Amino acid sequence: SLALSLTADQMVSALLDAEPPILYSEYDPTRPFSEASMMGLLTNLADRELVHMINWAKRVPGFVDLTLHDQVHLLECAWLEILMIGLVWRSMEHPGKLLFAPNLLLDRNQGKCVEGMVEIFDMLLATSSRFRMMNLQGEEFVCLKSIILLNSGVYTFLSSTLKSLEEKDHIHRVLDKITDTLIHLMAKAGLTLQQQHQRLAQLLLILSHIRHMSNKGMEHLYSMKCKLSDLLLEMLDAHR
């Protein structure tokens, strides 16, 4: 596995070059916002982002070393988390707003257009507020995002065989490498040793809130299918 042989700077450059683009939505500003129109805009945008996320995951060091069944499981478990931290990241410089797309910038008053969505909007805004206070860096964001992909489904594997536990073991070795990368960035940014572990802890504790936001979002997406696209229909079906 070439992932374990990458240096810290090579890890960052690899992740930065693999960054997916910032897609646009078909938001027509003249159409009156409705519950059906806004949910459609968010769904169409999320479906096109999934195609980029799938190809981004293949460029994350150590991901392709995993079995195809393991790759499927990690993306199915973490896809909404990865969309959410990406939404939160590009919304940092827009306080009180959520930048779903460069032409779709929304506030909480517009999240009330869908029942139960405003409560998750507040959590996304609160998370985006935190990245702003911490002055999160892009090199740190791409580390957090890769941690999410490798960590969200690592304790949900079947792993019926003893050799299937080796697949769990390899993921842990890559995650330790990403931890080494995060510390490398913070020591190089002039932080002391005490400041490094404190920031490292603050960053990983936000991932608990991102998992919480995903679980709550997935729950409402269960009822929204009762009231789209085939790939997103199967991603969501993996959580029912």
Binding site: I54, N55, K58, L68, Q71, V72, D230, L231, E234, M235
Partner: peptide, 11 residues
């Protein structure tokens, strides 16, 4: 096979 399976397998 699911859609995610083919896209991951696409080369």
């Amino acid at each position: 096979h699911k859609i995610l399976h083919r896209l991951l397998q696409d080369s």
